[model samples]
Target: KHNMKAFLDELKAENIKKFLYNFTQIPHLAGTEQNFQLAKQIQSQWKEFGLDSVELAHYDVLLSYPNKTHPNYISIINEDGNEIFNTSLFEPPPPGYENVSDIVPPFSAFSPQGMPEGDLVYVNYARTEDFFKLERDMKINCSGKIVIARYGKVFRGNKVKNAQLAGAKGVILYSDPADYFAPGVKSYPDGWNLPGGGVQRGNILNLNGAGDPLTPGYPANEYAYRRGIAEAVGLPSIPVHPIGYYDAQKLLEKMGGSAPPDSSWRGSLKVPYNVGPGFTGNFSTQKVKMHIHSTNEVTRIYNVIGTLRGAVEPDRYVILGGHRDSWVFGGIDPQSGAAVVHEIVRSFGTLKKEGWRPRRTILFASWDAEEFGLLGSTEWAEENSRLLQERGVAYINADSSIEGNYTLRVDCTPLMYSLVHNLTKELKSPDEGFEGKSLYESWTKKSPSPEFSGMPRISKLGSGNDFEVFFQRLGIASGRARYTKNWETNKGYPLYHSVYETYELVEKFYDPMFKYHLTVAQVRGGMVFELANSIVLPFDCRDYAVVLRKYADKIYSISMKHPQEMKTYSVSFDSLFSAVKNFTEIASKFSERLQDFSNPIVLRMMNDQLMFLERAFIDPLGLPDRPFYRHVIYAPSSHNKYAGESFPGIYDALFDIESKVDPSKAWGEVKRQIYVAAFTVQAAAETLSEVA
Candidate 1:
């Protein structure tokens, strides 16, 4: 508790200063040339912060069509009435040249790259079953049509893929402004305007053949060269882009079809978001196709390795990482955490400078191009995954460390829960006069007078940022760490994806006091320090087992609600339920005795459990044809890019149920998750046995 406050006070002064300076200077928005410049800047800053060494690293990335001037945009029109509905300039239209001034054209990135004409058809969000329904009904021949779909039922990639499969030539995704936004609202401050801000840009790269798309089988780092772009496995087959409903409103108002859309088919627009063809004018689009030269500037980016050189068992590793990369001028995204990282680094460096040492090595990583789909860390983990399992203890990652603390979120082996919980207890809350409050206590508090009530356990980790390769692919006991502010619950929620993603703006409104950012620095630093100093690496199996049991119940309930076909691959429910029970029983006795074990004994036991945990989670055969994915508990479904949450592989596999080469076979890959969970339990049980 005393240590916790000490850390908080330092972070209060140091961390916030760093955040203010950075947000004012750099505004990180990924995919632009400016992002690379930020990487070089961080390398220089960290090096100056007095780390032993620092390096800048680079990998190839494609900066595709520039949205400002790219002519790949289209508009919808009525065939019989000859009326155009939307404006191409207002929204990011698809990759086609169709001039229809009567209708307001919506902007989309992936309108068919070269197609000038196609029949107009409406597909309801294009759900997997919806496509099946279309085929069965035999009413709508989707061939050669531009499949217009509403946003949200599935991933954008899924919609694109489904249209391609249905013999459609193009796809358009529009946000139903009626669902979230009200009309006549101001663009900023007073209201939420659709398309009044920057477009929500993202990749459609499928995660079927997972891991880092660039490196594939290898690690993405300086020493390891990536495979050629032509060889990268998960590239998209069709073009895709998103639009606000204003564009849809114009299209639906002017659609000429006799068949009115089903009630559910209507968007927030005053008129129907329709499926049309019968009442139409000529609708056409074309694109300028050309190859442009792109370069991935080669440089060295450091993975700062801090060793206390454990006095008892020095070879073992306990890792903590957060990507230092931002799209450009990243105050809220990567730099928020990066600022805290440097503060933590300074504390560790200070401790080491004062001749203090730890029981294990702590490796800190600042990854690059994380927004480009976990490229840097995936490559690194692939190269070191085997060796890491052999010598490593546990890994904790923080991608976008922000202000506004929430309930802790974690993903780890059952054995490490106690360790993390204890560390949280020793961490102080900067808002509460540096009182040592477990993350839960601080998170649940409504006021300081009576403190607060106990909070729920942290949420589970899915995908996004640097943790992907560590927890999901490498199968290590790992999870992400971050502060989620209350603004999400307040009026500030709309700022997440819009132009409000600026750091200077966030300081004034979101964290005006800047206390939250400092707290993170202190808490993260103290946790790292205690982990380094502790006799036995602090971890908790009981909490993990408990969490898994909850996941089992949740999945079972969800499976019951879905169709029978969706429930066929429910094997993961039983696997997790049984495994959690087994692990919990083993943990009950071990957790009580962990503190008594000698450092060497604890080290060996921890190492064994970690290795077994990785092996149990990763499939020896890999996920169907996607060899890079070894864990079922983690990984992004091909559809939910960057949103990052739990996805049973079965969900993605169901999309391919109709193919002769069934995609549903990927669910069988979950045998890997079950194996790993059980294996980890046994290893922990043995670790307990040694102490017993």
Candidate 2:
């Protein structure tokens, strides 16, 4: 009944490597033939592995692409319009995969096609504040200029959106060696630094929302209403393109504008970093021009779902999902996760072949178009909203399972924290140096938090991957586990989202022996085993209640720092304090329900109550203006799309205390969000109360 480790032998590191090698061979960007065929292949494999049912969930989505025949490029043209320098939109391949064809060219997804040429304005990072610094402090107007910004610290989509709001006509994004490269790391084809020609491609649709940009709350099925792109959330206008540093340097060295205000704004370029609006001394006549073209079309995407029906609770679901699509041969970004999922599916099927049956249903979902803003899973959840909201138990996300081999990183709502702690403590880490030691043993040493002391910390659910919809919107208890790089060494590997993220890169730098891949497969496999087979569902309602209390404390800490303006508005955390106390009492009682399993009806009802506990924090109106982000407890910050804002409603209201805005409205917003935080936590407590 409890021998999960026994069946995991079917998952071999070599098998995962083979899966990775096969998937990385082609450009499987969402909406492409390679990705479509890959979906079909996954469907066949699941059916062959003795799954009870398998189906490809399709969503007709609005997607964007570059025009190759015409091609998009950045050029510096003189007064005669002759080119001083021009960048090829294509990225050259790695050593072994050089012959790989049909590569998706370098371009930002969802960037509107236009050729709004003007002088380049060097804006560091182009985050909300960076632009604010330019227009407000430096008095450099970005209007009518093409903004050139380095990539790091902000989501690429928000970077373009910030530029547009500043009245910039276009934007050029590039990777600087300061953020992407370390001192001694060799360039790619030999090592993992961003090569001169390495261009990072990503989506630029940032309304602080997920799913099909055209279809927000609803699925992209046939009957679904598709909103026009012009009104899509945070969709960019004008023109936007991505370039390698090779092209960016040609424009930067010729700058005529002021020197950067701070040394921090500078990159590792040999030339002095200058804030530019146009060419200086020798090249005064040259102006930066971009010819950006795109093909926006309604295309079909797929999510492959295969079920291993539970012996007792066939209707209750425990979903394991990750994306199959990549920006460009996403070796670490997704296919690493994909390789793990493929093997996990194989092993779970092998267990079924050995006559084992779980107590609850397990759905293995290979979501498509996740690179296009969590498209496949979001649409599926939206389509099956009713069913999932009623019966969905928990979700374990395998998205990009291994980014590096240093330490296993875990992120989840508090509900999944207990499950993660168990598996990580019991399971052996793949690191040879720590032979016979558990992952948690090594994790505490590698990445321990001050709050938890010797224990490793778990991050809140952030809107970056497939888990966002389930955790934030639907309130399905969700989590993700990945082996990540040592933070002390690097922030992001250079080949990320670059064309050079091929099979050999993984073989050379990331996980040469593939043991980390096998460990990830094992870790995911163990989680499914526990979630599916357990009668109690393995949730910690008290842990959830405690986290709620902690969030309230953090909110209060922020409030204490604020001026008596909060008192001027008569805003206080009294409501939140009362709610947390009520929640703590009710949650302890909820855990008491777990102590007894004598009655099947009572047991079923209690588990269902636990499942909906996450949903209770949701507000149909969503966070302030961001209607798609419904979770009051956690949502992406308005500016930084990747950062997880805890007690988001309150945090947004406080406006970080330092952000100066209209006191009349921004002050009102604070009180409302504070109430929202209290009320949502109060509602979740009620949900955990008597089901009748």
Candidate 3:
């Protein structure tokens, strides 16, 4: 307990800013020269931090890049095929900009090379529901048109997938101010919101999986097996491009079709939100076309892995991780996260010098290629999977650690939920305006967990970050925490994935004092200490009883949404409910027995049981179709990457039925999903039973 007291004193805002300033000065995209140089710097620094071992975990993997010489562009054409005008591909940066010559131009990674063009079609968010409104509700045909979609409300990859399925030839993605700007904020240079020229660069790899596509379910090591690119699975096939609202408005004003229903489609722009197959008036005969010339190649990427060996259980590990790569100058993306991890290690180095050691080893990772679909972490986890399943305690992730100064937000598996609640209650809120209250009080007031009631909501772990493989694939306890904005309505930190995301933005806009960054580092550092040093692993299995019940209840309500279909298949949630009930009973009994820890052998048995509690949810076969996503209770929404869903296999089976394309086969799939969900939960209760 005293160890944390001194550790807290060592966490200075300036030390964090020191790292932040160095990191954001350049674009350190994975596999690039700058990223490699930084990797060496990080390796050199870790060696001096009293770590027992440090190594660069290297692997060869596929990576995509935009045309370095000729930037991709979108243009408007005449009926006579004359190119009337074309949009600019580069963002002319904020006045605080530097190193302009090295800025990577805007391009969606993995967007296949193509010069596809057609009439424009505005499909709102371009989600499945959005597409449903167009094809089924609105009766508007999108076949062969280039669909214009605004980012957010879903993953970019899903947007492209839905558009492709709707017979679209290509996609034009933009950040409509409705999703990117705050309610009352001014634009950047004046305020923190994005300028019109801020184009978000991102990856569009939706091969329905994560990691190096060539080496799925395994590591991308030199001697490991690999697949050929021509036969590679999961790469998005259609051509796609992203533009800033400055360019989007030009196309928005030209949309010729009828306006969507008032309630369904709207944006922050002043231009009319119209459904379109062509431009309005004079431009109607013309079309919106794009030239996407992206390419892929096999490149080497390395993760900086450093470990501080434990004095006691050196075999067991607690991992703290954050990605090192960014879309551009990722001031708020990974760098802020990097600063947090670095600060924690630096503070720990001080304690290590004073002869303190954790009961279990602590490993810190500066992961690579996360922005391109969590490639680095996934490949590494798959490589050491045998050890991970046996000795891995938990993975704590801090990506974009501070998106805003609003408050703390945490997403985790149920086993790690109590630790978030218990540790947070001990710290003062970072926001001084909260009247010097504790984080628990501030969070409870802002947004309490609905299931736990009176505690900050612990969002179920979803993909789009490094922790996915740890939690989903292998059922290791994992979580992510951040000081975020009011994310429901506004997208936090508007310059996300844009060229305008620089150190100046974070200092001037997000955290002027870096007070919030210090608070976050404190929280995560405390988490690492408790999990790594405690004799009895700091996990409470009983919490899963409530967490599972909620997921069951939500899925139950989902069944209510389609009574006809549930009845058509005669599928009942009765089995799901009983399993949750059984899990609750056993969890309660197991938690009640935690009263004794003096007996070392018995304590080891109890701790071992807690370690394997999350493992019960894993089914070898994995989620129905998305095998890479193995957690039965948690997985990324097939429709939205940065989202979570309960019983996703069942949820997707029912929702995916399309109410089209062979209803008989779809109903059979839904029944099988229910069978597995109940069994998966039922097995979880068995995992908690007495060893006697």
Best by lDDT: 3
Q: Rate the local accuracy (lDDT) of all candidates.
A: 0.52, 0.84, 0.85
Off by over 4 Å in 2: 656-661, 690-692
Q: What's the residue-level lDDT of 574 in candidate 2?
A: 95
Rank the candidate models, highest TM-score first: 3, 2, 1
Each model's TM-score? 0.75, 0.97, 0.97
- Model 2 per-residue lDDT tens digits across residues 1-692: 42677656678899899999888888888988889999999999999887899999999987888887989998888889887789876887777677888788889888787877688889999988888788889999999999999999978887888898999999999989888887887988878888988999888887466588788888899888778777765578878888888877887888888889899889998767788777788787778888888877789999999999999999999999999998888888789898899888888887788888788999999999888788899999989989898888989999776777788887788987788788888878778688999888888788896588778877887777888888778878887888888988665567789998878889889898898888788778788888888888888889888888888899888878866777787778899999999999999887776784568888888888888888888898887777778888899777778778898888877764556567757777778888888888898999888767
Q: How many residue pairs collide in each prediction?
A: 57, 0, 1
Candidate with better lDDT, 2 vs 3: 3
Candidate 2 local lDDT, residue 85: 85
The parts of candidate 3 lying over 4 Å away from their true place are: 96-99, 451-453, 487-491, 564-568, 656-658, 661-664
Residue 41 lDDT in model 2? Answer: 96
